[PDB]
Symmetry: D2
Subunit: 378 residues, 4 copies
């Protein structure tokens, strides 16, 4: 994938992203000029359908792009992954929803908050939505949001969906005050008595049934990938990328500085484990995609292995960054320097629901025993 | 130890230290109020000689006090431990040096920087000292510094000593800009062509030979404790304390949330057990050394080796436990201004101290087990 | 505690135990002469009541003795611990049951199997017991067994008790065929349609309620210790002792190698081998400090006429399963470091390694069981697990 | 795919028998004759043998995949298979005349080894005088030649490190194998006393690493240009990875039955499930890196390109680590299984002992590889030849 025009353009941009990393942290928001430059590489177009001028790319290319960006700036990589994957999600909505978003401008971005921090009440022609959806990474750089929650009919939940809402109908509250991923501006999308029409709503069950309405026109194999791989991989990929960036920064600084065999061992351990994380994370995605391209269903056993290795990829990345940070010692404490930033950033990314390791591990083991699984994050 | 008057007074202070932990980080040094409150508890007097109004206390009492303070505020616990132990170090200097410092005011504090970031050239009546000694925790709150470095004679190092220098003779550079232990104000003490008289310089070899001049008047057994246990334990005790604080904060917060996740329960079992193990060994080795001294017996080298082995490991267990708790807590723990992420950053910052390097102690311990020569003096 | 007469006599015996370790494995049984020598030290009397000529000792002394024995021979240490603790358990049974066992010979030994592998049906005068109780360590060396199981009444289980049964009423089946603790002879006690009188049955609930009938005459504070600490610590202490033995064997062998090595040899300056030794010794010591520490704290409270608080019983279980874990992790580090030399059959370190991993399987070593319970306690949620 | 290769299909048919006979193999303290004959029949030993001798001169990933498969059924048989099989690669680098000495009448002849220096050869006219007692020669009872590692002695000093190729008529095998794991490997001692070894039967490891080994003239297949530093240590890690796959399958089979038969501990034990997740993921990571590094090296050679030193360093890094991941994973499964797993004669405790025995091999020492890798990352000089 390194030869792809998008990858080559991203390569040219990395020094800019590194130089801006502290400013990004300080301002608690990705700089507009970084997002513009990322847009210009074609990055956001990677998972966007061909009908909207997108690449509808091999998903490994997308995650490889994310890994690269995150290796320069953890917050920019995190935002890039999440915002970029929403272009995949929107491909599954109705054609009319896609036209609402992209009909005049195919570079329009969408942010998200998928945890149920609000709900939609059934009304004529759609839903009345209320909520305060926290943790919307990069939400200032989007003009729509996809927001997860139950549909309420006659007082009971009857579906679990994403509501697509334009920014004219919501307020962003600046609350992002955290120890890591400070640059992500993961602020809160506040929705008050908002009408959302039916065509702008997509059930996660329709997605997993392979009946999402977007599939009729967006026929590319990438859109048949399971959400339980696509979304959690978008969360792990940037953390793996952070580990690459941390590794390179550490070895560069230490190389110059260098009879300590222990520092060498930590470097060996970290580099091996980062590589293992990437091999599994990208490998499971490649295997799923190969089956789809061959017209096959992705076997449930593969979806389970994907989740198993994906949470573990995050853990390997964090363990590896921890080793390097610890080994670096006093010099790494200095504010403004890359290694301590990757460290705080990776630990912040770790909190995402999709990174909880026992959730995935317990499910995987349940499958190995042929016992029923009700968890939908797969 | 919990019933000691100093410990009871420190208990009364903890809520305040907790409340003020963020403002302490933001100030990048300990607030004046906190140092004054700590002083008024008698804490700094714990290891100070009785001749100066001190308690010359059981060293376990001192480290228990540090553990308690650090459980409320990591930066304050770190500074308290380091500044407090300098009162023990000064007890070993000449009577005249102790008089210079405490002769008019027995509450005077001393900061340090023991890494060789400067040196003293031999001259008539003393030394000419030059250096820029970084990482002097709490230096803004002291009016003297003890500074480690070689004595230079005929262009060769001939001793390794601490130079005791009053604040009138040095400049403090505000450079403290770090990810953790932010409130410690571990600034840089800059010394330029300063005369230090002979009586204000103490060799670490005299100390380890049990010939420090201060022993003649300060006869309490605590002053015969080995530096290789006293100094490194100073650096581990606050980190263990941070882990106790991190644990209490996490269980309080989580308990409320919980009132079926067996994994969160397992992490708290692992963390509480490992913190307790760290404290049992750290305090146990100190207690064992001290018991021998109280009995008029020598501290055997094997015990000094065990102390170093377990002390670096105590720091490791404390950090590993904090990591577990912080991980387990998840999203709620990222918020700026909340205790758990602060303890996490603070513990990882304390980890960088030379006396916490674990392989250094482990390799020495192993060398000892094989009956091979040891030249490392940090023991 | 090493000035105690029992400890001094055990010290004198250790070389014999070490020399016999391979034979003990090969025969799958503790040698009769080892059990006799152990008896002659006074070891089995340590937790036995004063009325029967016993020491009714500080429990830390008992576990210290166990630690010592197990450091010489893992199987002998394992058997010694479990058989020794049965003398504590019997102190809680009725006076009449103790008289049945010790009335003519206060050196009689009892084996056990506390997992429910049989049951007792209520009948006039007691119970009809049926079972096949596996894993009865050292059962050949005992003339009674205490066997854990439910009482059946109206064809429902109504209590969980130990049935005290003499050897004339059971058969031992030799089935012990395992990868470690081979010497323990942990065979199966088979009980067929046997009458067990009321006075020879003791409920664990009665024990926990401090209403066990033996407490009336056996008033020493050690008998008020909680089973949830006493029995699991009897399982961890020998594994900790195995770790001490493994450590000493490793350092003795390696020390000779390194001192005999030449200037440029790997063995002369291997910092990694040194680090593994530091890690192992520290973690073994931590295991012992907590395991013995929690026992000491419980006992001190009892000596002071106080109850043992539940929070302490929870900490005891937490640290006890962890002590087993620390001991095994440490042996693993040493065995791995030793490398090719350690593979040789008949040598001590690989034996301690297999032995510790075998001891690990005991129900009382399952770490998540204790950890989850401890965490439940910290959250102020209800606990129903009785192994505490 | 490798799984469709004729040798792999034939090995598949043999696995149940190898599993069944694992205990009798340990008890015999060497591989049974039947097993070696069956393995020979599959074509397995021919995998890395040159085509001029009827061999497959195969993609080395195919060879290590075969080893993984065999080792998943029987740790000792997989260990011997890997080692004996790789000697057919090593012999391909010796002179044509040496290969002719070994295979000129019977191309099924096997060679054992002991590469650690446990002997030496003194320079004499026409060759060397060799003396040694080379321990740990896995499967030596099943070979009629040995390749023995040691220095060459010239004017009383060691001038080169070579392998001496010696026929069985010239050495004695001492039955000494008495160990806690890999019991079935029969890793006995090859004793050599005042033996003449001609020049054409001696191969310098430096000649190999310089790409000047004489066997390369006729044996031109790209597999023979692979670096020894990857080839030999991978032969030591691959069977341990296979043992972990076998341990995993045995454990999940046994446990799955238990759990599905359980009623309202085995019914809902999330910890057992986590150990399964951890072990499976780490075993997979081990194999991906171990096989991936070999694949990347081989792809370069197939393309007529050089294998960069950086890749050789990564290979050693991941290879020692693969052994560690395999052992850690087996440990997890054995611990989780608990009491049931202690029974003698059952598979999981055997894989556990076997993996811990394989761990002692020089090529598995992990700090050795890790320190070397770190030295390379700093751009500092490396003198270690195991790369």
């Amino acid at each position: 994938h390194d030869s792809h025009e998008v990858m080559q353009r991203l390569d040219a941009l990395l020094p800019t992203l590194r130089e801006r990393a502290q400013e990004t942290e300080d301002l608690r928001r990705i700089p507009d000029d970084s997002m513009k430059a990322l847009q210009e590489t074609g990055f956001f177009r990677l998972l966007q359908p061909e009908q909207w001028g997108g690449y509808q790319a091999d998903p490994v290319l997308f995650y490889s792009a994310v890994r690269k960006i995150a290796s320069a700036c953890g917050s920019t990589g995190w935002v890039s992954s999440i915002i970029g994957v929403h272009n995949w999600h929107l491909a599954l909505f109705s054609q009319q929803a896609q036209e609402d978003v992209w009909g005049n401008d195919t570079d329009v971005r969408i942010s998200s908050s998928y945890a149920p921090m609000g709900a939609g009440q059934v009304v004529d022609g759609g839903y009345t939505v209320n909520g305060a959806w926290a943790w919307s990474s990069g939400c200032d750089h989007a003009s729509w949001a996809v927001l997860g929650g139950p549909v309420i009919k006659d007082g009971r939940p009857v579906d679990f969906v994403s509501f697509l809402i334009p920014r004219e109908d919501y307020r962003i509250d600046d609350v992002w005050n955290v120890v890591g991923l400070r640059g992500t501006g993961s602020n809160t999308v506040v929705v008050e008595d908002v009408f959302v029409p039916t065509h702008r709503v997509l059930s996660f069950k329709a997605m997993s049934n392979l009946t999402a309405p977007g599939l009729e026109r967006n026929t590319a194999p990438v859109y048949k990938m399971p959400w339980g791989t696509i979304h959690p991989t978008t969360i792990s990929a940037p953390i793996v990328g952070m580990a690459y960036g941390a590794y390179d920064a550490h070895v560069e600084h230490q190389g110059k500085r260098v009879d300590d065999p222990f520092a060498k061992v930590r470097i060996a351990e970290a580099s091996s484990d980062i590589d293992a994380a990437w091999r599994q994370l990208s490998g499971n995605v490649a295997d799923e995609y190969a089956l789809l391209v061959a017209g096959e269903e992705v076997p449930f056993e593969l979806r389970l292995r994907a989740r198993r290795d994906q949470v573990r990829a995050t853990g390997r990345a964090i363990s590896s960054i921890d080793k390097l940070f610890e080994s670096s010692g006093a010099t790494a404490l200095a504010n403004g320097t890359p290694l301590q930033r990757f460290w705080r950033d990776a630990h912040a990314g770790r909190v995402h629901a999709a990174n909880d390791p026992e959730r995935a591990y317990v499910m995987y083991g349940t499958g190995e025993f042929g016992l029923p699984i009700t968890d939908t994050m797969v």
